[PDB]
Amino acid sequence: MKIAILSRDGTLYSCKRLREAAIQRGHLVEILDPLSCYMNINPAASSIHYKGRKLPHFDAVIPRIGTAITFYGTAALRQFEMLGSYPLNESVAIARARDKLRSMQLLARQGIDLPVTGIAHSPDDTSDLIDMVGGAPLVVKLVEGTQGIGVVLAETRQAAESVIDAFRGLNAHILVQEYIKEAQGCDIRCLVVGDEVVAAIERRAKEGDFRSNLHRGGAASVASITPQEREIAIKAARTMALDVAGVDILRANRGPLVMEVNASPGLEGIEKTTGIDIAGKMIRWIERHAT
Amino acid sequence: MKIAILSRDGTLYSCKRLREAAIQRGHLVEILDPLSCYMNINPAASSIHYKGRKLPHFDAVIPRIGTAITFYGTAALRQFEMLGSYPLNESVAIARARDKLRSMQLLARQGIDLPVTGIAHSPDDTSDLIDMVGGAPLVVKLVEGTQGIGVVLAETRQAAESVIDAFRGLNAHILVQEYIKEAQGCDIRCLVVGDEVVAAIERRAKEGDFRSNLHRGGAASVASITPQEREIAIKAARTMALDVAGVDILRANRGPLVMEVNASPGLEGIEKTTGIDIAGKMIRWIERHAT
Amino acid sequence: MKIAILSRDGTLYSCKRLREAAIQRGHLVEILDPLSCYMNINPAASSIHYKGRKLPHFDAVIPRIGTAITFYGTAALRQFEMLGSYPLNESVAIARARDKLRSMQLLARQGIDLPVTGIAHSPDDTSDLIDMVGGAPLVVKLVEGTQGIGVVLAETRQAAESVIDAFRGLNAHILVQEYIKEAQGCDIRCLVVGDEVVAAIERRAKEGDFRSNLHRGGAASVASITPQEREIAIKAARTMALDVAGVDILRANRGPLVMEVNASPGLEGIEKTTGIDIAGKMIRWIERHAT
Amino acid sequence: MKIAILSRDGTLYSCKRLREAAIQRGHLVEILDPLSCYMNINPAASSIHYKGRKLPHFDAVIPRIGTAITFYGTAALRQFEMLGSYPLNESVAIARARDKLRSMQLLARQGIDLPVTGIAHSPDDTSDLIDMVGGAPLVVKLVEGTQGIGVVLAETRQAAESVIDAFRGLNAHILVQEYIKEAQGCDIRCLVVGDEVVAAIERRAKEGDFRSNLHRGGAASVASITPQEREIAIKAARTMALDVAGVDILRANRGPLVMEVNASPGLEGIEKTTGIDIAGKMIRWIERHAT
Numbered sequence A, B, C, D: 001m002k003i004a005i006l007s008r009d010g011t012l013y014s015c016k017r018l019r020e021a022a023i024q025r026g027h028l029v030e031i032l033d034p035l036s037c038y039m040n041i042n043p044a045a046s047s048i049h050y051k052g053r054k055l056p057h058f059d060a061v062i063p064r065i066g067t068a069i070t071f072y073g074t075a076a077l078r079q080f081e082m083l084g085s086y087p088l089n090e091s092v093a094i095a096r097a098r099d100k101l102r103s104m105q106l107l108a109r110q111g112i113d114l115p116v117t118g119i120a121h122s123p124d125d126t127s128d129l130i131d132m133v134g135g136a137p138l139v140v141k142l143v144e145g146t147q148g149i150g151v152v153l154a155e156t157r158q159a160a161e162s163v164i165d166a167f168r169g170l171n172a173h174i175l176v177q178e179y180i181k182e183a184q185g186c187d188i189r190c191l192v193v194g195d196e197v198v199a200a201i202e203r204r205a206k207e208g209d210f211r212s213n214l215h216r217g218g219a220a221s222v223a224s225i226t227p228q229e230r231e232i233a234i235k236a237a238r239t240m241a242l243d244v245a246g247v248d249i250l251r252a253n254r255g256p257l258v259m260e261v262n263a264s265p266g267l268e269g270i271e272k273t274t275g276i277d278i279a280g281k282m283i284r285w286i287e288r289h290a291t
Ligand SMILES: Nc1ncnc2c1ncn2[C@@H]1O[C@H](COP(=O)(O)OP(=O)(O)O)[C@@H](O)[C@H]1O
Pocket: A115, A139, A141, A148, A150, A151, A177, A178, A179, A180, A181, A183, A185, A186, A187, A203, A205, A210, A211, A212, A213, A250, A259, A260
């Protein structure tokens, strides 16, 4: 079947691997830059054009939508949807999942155990806000629109006060979250494809730091996750209505706490440390649901 | 009943009039700046705090959400919702309605007759894109994220070419739309509250211009709208799931063409040229649905 | 004589008072919005146009250049200069004085006693940077380009660490400065016009805060400044090549420490608490140097 | 001698070639990321720190200052200057040369023949502005602060009108410039090092386009420049006070017209099409002036 991959870049590992795993399974594959799409929305279901030509009808389409071109990207994805394609992750689920606040809210509402987090833009009693989330030490993450630019630890009460009113009226909102010290800087990225966790790794932060992220200098090992964690990661990915999701989990004394739910997570590190054909698993899932 | 008004400013005409019309009908009213809210999202339904104190439970809440504080604003609104308040316009309908692209798509999908419009970010054959929407003359509107900053007319083919690749790769997407010359610069803003158009005015652009907008220098008269227009404005406001909406319509030879659907439209001009108690009508609608 | 006032707004107190004090002394005055100027730079000295007409030759021009329209504002000012007008503050001195870093450097180079301050964008050893400026407590001010958006206090070592790497790689540079605790939140804004301090006030920060600024909630009294302070404020305003300057001073145990040097300072508070005709003094200075 | 290269990236061709040509001539070379510098400005001449250590005294320093980190970059460069290093391009000349408007003004003032250009931010009579620069066809370049994001051609009067008020009030200023049609899309980048043009190439725009730039798809040949062009390129680079400059010239019927003067131009294309050791020439110039 013919399938498109929406990604402004098609050389990076994940998009390359998807192209490869899809031709390998007997499919035709085009990689399309969203920003180079253009189409009539009115009338409904008018074809999409790409560099002077119409496009053929794609039976399915993988969105790898840049965190920064989200509105136009999801607009193009939604046109493909309205024209009949099958989305590996629907556009409205992508939109929902971008807004980290809307998502934490939806998760807590469904009884998913998250860490205790509060939110604030230009608050007026920083001491009240700190008391609200259980006091120091705390993690302050901040966000410009949907983009989060900083995650920082504050171990004292004054450090929290300083960071909060440093960001106060800075025109970005912020989350203050209980610092899971017991994680020792470790985070478990599970990768849900449809109704199963198909992979999982453990990221370990480099010494003197708490930031799990690989790029920030972290180790990546293979993770052996409890059945409880598997269950709650699938429930999370359901709650968000994602066909493909990257659920991040912190192991806290009271249990597993979801902290982030990505909707087009990177493949390279998790494949290269587990050896699982994840692109293949999601192309299977397409095959099983495409038409 | 106790009701909040979410607006970063509470002195401007519309918020003042809502406060006035609500105390006048025997209600308690607080005006809250969203950015000064702060709350726990986890656990679910934890109270909201405002300048060092908890808030009381509001039976309903009017969002007047700044076009620029939309994510945090709708997050706070959604907390009020999850805590039991009634929203005059739900948060997800607000979010949907912000994204002008998602909205034009949803409208065309429901068979609402819009003007022929195409969309594009970094297109590659400007001549193909112009041919796509019926050629010159055309209106090019552009948008940064959801924010639109410019609307401009292009009467020649070269003017359209110049404007398009002037914006090409400018990192904003753009809509190219058929210029409704027959409107002679006139636009009809209807105001839907629940299931009825409660007001309507006609904006006339100042000579030498096509931009209907009042601020851009336009006249405002009372509009007498056809029953067809009333029907299609209510259908539009339904389609978007808005309890209160400002539907803009261009009168084109083939009929009435929706062009914009605002979700917290300004009241001052439409009240001051019609004399209708619009704030009263929407407080009624609250009363009828609150609890 | 004919004189222009470059200010995007002409209703605010300072520009109104300048217009008033200038017509009152027998002069013709136009207030021009820089952004509405347009001119040929090549050939040199071609006239300036403003809303469809040429402008007359102004014998002098007061720049009140918005902190946010600085490049185009100073471009227009420089055209007036090249065309013969006299600038109350030259364009290159304005440009220099915007960049707070370049200015602190120039001041320290001339032996002006500033507080000990260090600068940093994406530093790599926050503990080394803190040790560099004498350790906690410290004031962290940050800047986007030339715009500074935040000033914040950090009293502990961990608070300083948290704020610094909260801003680290945030794409704004930052100054870390010795906290002058002995100022008890008090700051002395002197206003230099030519070769004399013509006014001065003391700003007192509201309790529980250290930020002197009036808007942030500060009291304004009349200041009686030492001759030393007068001397060093005139030297500072010289060093920057400003004809009109607002020099801010902190009273520290070792002496008076310049901390900020504005080049178009506001008049309203300092006039309304001292009763000095400051607009008159600078129109005099024009008269004395114009031609 | 010890010499630093200020560039946030040190792998790109120009910085690599400078390192190579400098060790090759018997010098010690460090490549420093400006944003990773941090220093005390007060007291004057306090050492610079880089990743936890002090820096040694550099006898000279090459700025390759990112167009986007200009203020902090030039601040760090100015610290090196005040500490005794020799700058291949001084910091204030760099600052001057960034602002394209200030620079066109300075050039026209010195009698350098530029193309006829006018400037405008939020003009009010677009037809007057077009008439001002000689009417269509025209080139509209626009700029955000100092950053220019778009260059576009307008061949008709309506195309110019459309583009201008498309950008009007867009919060960027714009230049309207006479379109040098006789250049047939060709531009001559000369590279001045001290008092001599050491290289020069001709860029040819790809068919259907007028944009000379290499990346935009242009050919690069070796240019044989008149003595007049050599003279006026050296005069331009003088006027700006640059030790190393990239002067761009359009060949117009009335003569050679400077159009752009870069202060850290790229080396790769001009070296790889001429075979001149340009990095060597500027390291020579250092040697001749260092100390
Ligand atoms: N509540 C927390 N407790 C401890 N560490 C956290 C917490 N939240 C985030 N982190 C750290 O930051 C990393 C990712 O945080 P995240 O919110 O994903 O920031 P980013 O969006 O930059 O990746 C994790 O590996 C983890 O170490």
